[PDB]
Amino acid sequence: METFDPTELPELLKLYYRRLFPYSQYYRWLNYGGVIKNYFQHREFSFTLKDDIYIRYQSFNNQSDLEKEMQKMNPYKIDIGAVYSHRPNQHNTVKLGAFQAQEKELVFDIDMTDYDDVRRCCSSADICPKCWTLMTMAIRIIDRALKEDFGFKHRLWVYSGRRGVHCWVCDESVRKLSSAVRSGIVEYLSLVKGGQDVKKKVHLIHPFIRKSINIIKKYFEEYALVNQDILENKESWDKILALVPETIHDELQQSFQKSHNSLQRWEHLKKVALEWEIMLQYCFPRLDINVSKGINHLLKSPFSVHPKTGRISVPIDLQKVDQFDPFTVPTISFICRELDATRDYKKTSLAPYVKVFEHFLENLDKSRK
């Protein structure tokens, strides 16, 4: 896309919320078939408004109310929270201890910024087609586990609008899970641990680990050795050696002198040994226990507009995950200009992402029978 001009946001958001934001589908999602009384009415939303004012515990009676209020506010940001015991918008007059978060989707947030230590292609602020593969591997690794291991059927993956991806797991039994169970699921999925301060972040037959390695193996040569060139030279192969036990920088150090490029140094490195701890530290999703653990946690809404890149937080088609290109995700300016020429929200580049969302909603409806 063309570089977004954020000075146009106020007028562009007005048009987007008036004519493009997919309210019918969004309500069909969060009302979950209307089978539980007040399920939508007790949903918390939060918004960031004019002047960067943040408000939470907003809630709405039905789709019309949500439309009217979003068109009044034209929010820069929208976050979705839990379903509560009472309407969030009356929480200040609910008795102490009685206002309780009851249900919420299980959510995950993987962001490129947590990989600064293992990519060589970008500054912490950029992404490129080389490092985006990290997100591809994250989706495959996490989605396989959610689908195959946990048996979760209703998984919506969503672009963050800039440099990450989110997952909303929406099964009926999943929305009821306790914070303790959510924590358990995160810890089951986590293998990379340690802040900036930690040089070795992976310490290892765990089936989930083997499964995840086998996914990584399909990408590793092209991603790590060919694209990231994690052994192009000394100050990078060093980083790897920092992960191998006390006593071998020697042999390796000197053969990396002899050997010519990352591919050779790798075929070598393997011979001696570890391989897995390396592959995982470089390729495995880094989670964030925080966002997934709490039933009341707020996460960016699908179909949000990113205030810096202008890009829409679009659903990602899992059947085309390897082809997903954040750089072709439409900006709000792009789709408003399409709408200006076509006069039909169906005749814009948003429509195909709404179709992905509709397939997700159709499966939810089928599950309810």
User: Do the annotations mark residue 128 as ligand-binding?
Assistant: yes
Residue 345 CA to residue 16 CA, distance in Å, equals 10
How many CB atoms lie under 10 A from the CB of residue 122? 16
Letter for the amino acid at 307? Answer: P
E strand or H helix that includes residue 45: strand 43-48
**Of 67, 79, 111, 143, which residue is the catalytic one?**
111
Which DSSP symbol is given to 3?
P
On whether the CB atoms of residues 160 and 111 are closer than 8 A, the answer is yes
> Cα separation of 209 and 188, whole Å?
10
| Under 8 Å between Cβ of 213 and 280 | yes
Catalytic residue at 117? no
Letters for 124-163 (x = contact with Zn ion by CB under 5 A, - = none) are ----x-xx--------------------------------
311 is in an annotated binding site: no
59 is in an annotated binding site: no
Closest separation in Å from C-beta 84 to Zn ion: 41
Residue 166 known to bind ligand: yes
Number of residues that bind Zn ion (CB under 5 A): 5
Q: In sequence order, what are the residues at sequence separation of 6 or more whose Cβ sits closer than 8 angstroms to the Cβ of residue 351?
A: 345
Task: 2-7: list long-range contacts, CB under 8 Å, 24+ apart.
Answer: 2/331, 2/333, 2/334, 4/308, 4/309, 4/310, 4/311, 4/331, 4/332, 4/333, 5/310, 5/333, 6/307, 6/308, 6/310
Residues 185-224 that bind Zn ion (CB under 5 A): none
Closest CA to 116 of 106, 129, 131: 131
Span of 115-123, 191-199, 211-219, 242-250 interacting with Zn ion by CB under 5 A: 115-123
Q: How far is the CB of 122 from Zn ion (least distance, A)?
A: 3
**Cβ 118 to Zn ion shortest distance, Å:** 11
Applying CB under 5 A, the span of 114-122, 165-173, 204-212, 358-366 interacting with Zn ion comes to 114-122
- 122 is an interface residue for Zn ion by CB under 5 A: yes
Comparison of 232 and 358: residue with beta carbon closer to Zn ion: 232
Q: How far is the CB of 132 from Zn ion (least distance, A)?
A: 7
Rounded to whole angstroms, how far apart are CA atoms 172 and 178?
A: 13
Which of 36, 94, 121, 321 forms a contact with Zn ion (CB under 5 A)?
121
With binding defined as CB under 5 A, does residue 229 bind Zn ion? no
336-365: contacts with Zn ion (CB under 5 A) = none
Nearer to Zn ion, 126 or 344 (CB): 126
Decide if 103 is catalytic.
no
- In three state form, how does the secondary structure of 90-132 look? HHHHCCCCCCCEEECCEEEEEEHHHHHHHCCCCCCCCCCCCCC
Q: Which of residues 258-277 bind Zn ion (CB under 5 A)?
A: none
Give min distance, CB of 129 to Zn ion, in A: 7
Query: Does residue 121 have a known ligand-binding role?
Result: yes
Could you tell me the two tokens for 321?
Answer: 């995950």
Task: Pick the closer one to Zn ion by CB: 81 or 326.
Answer: 326
> Per the annotation, does 322 bind a ligand?
no
Angle among Cα 326, 321, 270 to the nearest 5 degrees reads 100
Catalytic residue among 79, 103, 105, 109: 109
- Check if 171 is active-site: no
Question: Does the annotation list 197 as a binding residue?
Answer: no
Stretch that binds Zn ion, among 57-65, 118-126, 221-229, 256-264 (CB under 5 A): 118-126
Nearest approach in angstroms of CB 178 to Zn ion is 38
306: annotated binding-site residue? yes
8 A C-beta contact, residue 137 and residue 283: yes
**Active site residue ranges:** 44, 109, 111
* Interface residue list for Zn ion (CB under 5 A): 121-122, 128, 130-131
Residues annotated in a binding site for Mn(2+): 109, 111, 288
